[PDB]
Design a protein around this ligand. Structure first.
Ligand SMILES: COc1ccc2c(CC(=O)Nc3ccc(S(N)(=O)=O)cc3)cc(=O)oc2c1
Ligand SMILES: [Zn+2]
Length: 257
């Protein structure tokens, strides 16, 4: 089965998932000098006031904080987007060291980790239908750099001991994702894909220019997690990031000068 190790990591994925070598794969390096300002881009509209989190799950590749997406409660609109995209879950990708861990890079710079808030286009009715559509998803990507702690992340880091191994889940209600956002909503946008198998090309990527700062102790607790199930040999969950993919025939647009 796919993973992030020597024998099953991102160089191997194309054998099970040939779209790995497709025309709109993610992540990508964001070349800040080549991204064009697009003044017709609208401001991003993040409406998380009514977000309802339910649960947090170690799925063996990362941990997801899932939300109740059966009504329009936490939506992303505007920016490059047409219509309404509903929050379904967020997760992170992170490194074994502070020097690496993000999927997207900026002028080849790697951040310590990267947050992905995953939303689906409500005109497709459900997340499973949306992933099959070229404009099915909108993922908001936020870089994390190590410095001062992010207080709004701490509730997430503290529950990690209860989901150490693959398949473990834990109630996680009343978590407010607004506490994970940076001050600015300036962003780059391009068309891409899920960054893990099945690597479907269904994502409008929106990656915020401003990273959030998290403490070394916060990111250290991410690295205590396990890719394996309980009672299997311990492999730390670290370096669960796919490296930058060829941009090919795509332009990255900036929302800002
Ligand atoms: C029927 O419902 C579902 C629920 C989950 C998935 C999933 C699981 C999933 O959601 N993957 C996923 C989500 C987000 C990402 S990323 N790293 O690009 O933000 C990378 C991978 C994939 C899929 O094809 O069909 C599904 C259908
Ligand atoms: Zn992700």
């Amino acid at each position: 089965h796919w993973g992030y190790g020597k024998h099953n990591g991102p160089e191997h994925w194309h054998k099970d998932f040939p779209i790995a070598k497709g025309e709109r794969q993610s992540p990508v390096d964001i070349d800040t000098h080549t991204a064009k300002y697009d003044p017709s881009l609208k401001p991003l509209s993040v409406s998380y006031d009514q977000a309802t989190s339910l649960r947090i799950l170690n799925n063996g590749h990362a941990f997801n904080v899932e939300f109740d997406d059966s009504q329009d409660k936490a939506v992303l609109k505007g920016g490059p987007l047409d219509g309404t995209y509903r929050l379904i879950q967020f997760h992170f990708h992170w490194g074994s060291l502070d020097g690496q861990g993000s999927e997207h890079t900026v002028d080849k710079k790697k951040y310590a980790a990267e947050l992905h808030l995953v939303h689906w286009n409500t005109k497709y009715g459900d997340f499973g239908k949306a992933v099959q559509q070229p404009d099915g998803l909108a993922v908001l990507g936020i870089f994390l750099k190590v410095g001062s702690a992010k207080p709004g992340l701490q509730k997430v880091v503290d529950v990690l001991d209860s989901i150490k191994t693959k398949g473990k889940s834990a109630d996680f209600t009343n978590f407010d994702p607004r506490g994970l956002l940076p001050e600015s909503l300036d962003y780059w946008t391009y068309p891409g894909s899920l960054t893990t198998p099945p690597l479907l090309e269904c994502v409008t990527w929106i990656v915020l220019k401003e990273p959030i700062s998290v403490s070394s102790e916060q990111v250290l607790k991410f690295r205590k997690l396990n890719f394996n199930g309980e009672g299997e040999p311990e492999e730390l969950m670290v370096d669960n990031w796919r490296p930058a993919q060829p941009l090919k025939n795509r332009q990255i647009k900036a929302s800002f000068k």
